[PDB]
Write a protein that binds this ligand. Structure first.
Ligand code: NA
Length: 154
């Protein structure tokens, strides 16, 4: 399924700040019934957190370090799957552009795919975003059909 990541912490862990890690620890504690963890530990940004081993987590939380490490791995695996889904619907998007698109939608795959297609169709005419969104929405997000419609009615 999908983990209910916190709205403030919906950003990719690579872009997590010191405050984003602490907000993740407090959320993980109440959500998965983990042992109380001192926020004095893990005083690091998301870049240093993803370079920690399970033994390093275990040092900072002897009772919940193993579970914290496994939660971070589940979160990273979900992101890559979301990035893979964006690439399947929008051919040619790079791995970085797909990650930037997901972050602009709060991690929503469907909205990210729609935003990427609207951006391509928006350039094809002087129609507003709502018009480009309406056109794509009618054609069930088939960019090729929406493009032919826009090119046939400039
Ligand atoms: Na494209």
């Amino acid at each position: 399924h999908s983990i209910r990541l916190p709205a403030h912490l919906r950003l990719q862990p690579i872009y997590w700040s010191r405050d984003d890690v602490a907000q993740w620890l407090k959320w993980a504690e109440n959500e998965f019934s983990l042992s109380p963890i001192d926020s004095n530990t893990f005083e690091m940004n998301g870049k240093a957190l993803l370079l920690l081993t399970k033994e390093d987590f275990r040092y900072r939380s002897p009772h919940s370090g193993d579970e914290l490490y496994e939660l971070l791995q589940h979160i990273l695996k979900e992101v890559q799957r979301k990035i893979m889904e964006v690439e399947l619907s929008v051919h040619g998007v790079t791995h970085q552009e797909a990650q930037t698109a997901l972050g602009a939608t709060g991690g929503d795959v469907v909205s990210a795919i729609r935003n990427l297609k609207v951006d391509q169709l928006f350039h094809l005419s002087s129609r507003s975003r709502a018009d480009a969104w309406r056109i794509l929405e009618h054609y069930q997000w088939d960019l090729s059909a929406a493009s032919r419609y826009v090119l046939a009615r400039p």
